[PDB]
């Protein structure tokens, strides 16, 4: 509730906080690359006469 | 496992450090001041 | 919305201060630019209530004019080329012989 937040700004300031935080970590252990992976499964088969 | 071993102490110290900085905010919006959690911070060693 | 809900209005209380009833002097560099930009949009505003206003009279105009756009999306979507993926230069060329 708004009115909740209102009268309790220091409370909110403690939501906004932990959400960047967790912004901040899941950044350091998060992978990037260029595309998601999309690559579809391949199998060959091989045999000589 | 010595392989192993090496690697995995470092970490440690750094999730004690975490866990201050979140009971902090924890604190302070509970009793809506800033000041109030520190009081509360300090009884930490006592136990230890 | 969560954030809206929760941060902003906390903020909007504290941050904000009550406007001052009375502020005679009001002048400012930064300030005239604003009274003009402040002032133009209003302009913007009048016009916008007097198209609808002959808008909601002229229902054939209105509707001739709706045609013509969704017309031209459909000759629009005709003509526009397609493709997959954008092509892009990474440094390598592959020659096959």
């Given at each position: 509730?708004?009115?909740?937040?209102?009268?309790?700004?220091?409370?909110a300031?403690?939501?906004?906080?932990?959400?960047?935080?967790?912004?901040?970590?899941?950044?350091?252990?998060?992978?990037?690359?260029?595309?998601?992976?999309?690559?579809?499964?391949?199998?060959?088969?091989?045999?000589?006469? | 496992?010595?392989?192993?071993?090496?690697?995995?102490?470092?970490?440690?110290?750094?999730?004690?450090?975490l866990?201050?900085?979140?009971?902090?905010?924890?604190?302070?919006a509970?009793?809506?001041?800033?000041?109030?959690?520190?009081?509360?911070?300090?009884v930490?060693?006592?136990?230890? | 919305?969560?954030?809206?809900?929760?941060?902003?209005?906390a903020?909007?209380?504290?941050?904000?201060?009550?406007?001052?009833?009375?502020?005679?002097?009001?002048?400012?560099?930064?300030?005239?630019?604003?009274?003009?930009?402040?002032?133009?949009?209003?302009?913007?505003?009048?016009?916008?209530?007097?198209?609808?206003?002959?808008?909601?009279?002229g229902?054939?105009?209105?509707?001739?004019?709706?045609?013509?756009?969704?017309?031209?999306?459909?000759?629009?979507?005709?003509?526009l080329?397609?493709?997959?993926?954008?092509?892009?230069?990474?440094?390598?060329?592959?020659?096959?012989?």
């Open positions: 509730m708004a009115q909740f937040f209102i009268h309790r700004p220091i409370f300031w403690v939501i906004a906080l932990v959400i960047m935080l967790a912004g901040i970590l899941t950044l350091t252990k998060m992978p990037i690359a260029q595309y998601p992976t999309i690559a579809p499964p391949t199998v060959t088969i091989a045999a000589t006469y | 496992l010595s392989l192993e071993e090496r690697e995995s102490g470092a970490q440690a110290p750094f999730l004690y450090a866990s201050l900085l979140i009971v902090f905010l924890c604190l302070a509970l009793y809506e001041s800033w000041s109030i959690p520190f009081s509360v911070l300090l930490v060693p006592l136990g230890v | 919305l969560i954030v809206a809900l929760t941060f902003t209005p903020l909007c209380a504290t941050i904000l201060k009550q406007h001052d009833p009375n502020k005679e002097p009001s002048n400012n560099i930064f300030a005239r630019f604003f009274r003009s930009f402040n002032n133009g949009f209003d302009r913007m505003s009048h016009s916008y209530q007097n198209g609808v206003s002959r808008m909601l009279k229902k054939i105009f209105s509707g001739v004019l709706y045609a013509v756009v969704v017309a031209l999306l459909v000759f629009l979507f005709q003509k080329p397609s493709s997959f993926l954008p092509e892009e230069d990474q440094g390598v060329v592959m020659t096959l012989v």
